[PDB]
């Protein structure tokens, strides 16, 4: 749905996130066209040195079907993952928005 995208390359994600209308925290979860079940989280944020940037985080998979960006905290699915980082940055560069 709105935050989930299939087959979107790293650079397409970059163009989409950097478009006017997007703010810090704007983000999207993308699935690799080649390796099904392989997800990445792309976020818009501000770098003091760089300026507006798009960061990329690798979502890893558990053997039980679940996910995590940091072993510290795991989730049963992509929704729960979004609900958490949406509420706390918890390790990320900034909380997600929308």
């Amino acid at each position: 749905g709105s935050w989930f995208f299939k087959n979107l390359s790293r650079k397409d994600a970059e163009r989409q996130l950097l478009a006017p209308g997007n703010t810090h925290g704007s983000f999207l979860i993308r699935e690799s066209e080649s390796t099904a079940g392989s997800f990445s989280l792309s976020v818009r944020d501000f770098d003091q040195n760089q300026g507006e940037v798009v960061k990329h985080y690798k979502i890893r998979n558990l053997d039980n079907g679940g996910f995590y960006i940091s072993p510290r905290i795991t989730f049963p699915g992509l929704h729960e993952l979004v609900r958490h980082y949406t509420n706390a940055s918890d390790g990320l560069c900034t909380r997600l928005s929308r």
């Binding site: 990329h56 690798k58 940091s70 990320l92």
Partner: peptide, 8 residues
């Protein structure tokens, strides 16, 4: 490697 952000 791709080059993903390091997290703690």
């Amino acid at each position: 490697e791709g080059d993903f952000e390091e997290v703690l």
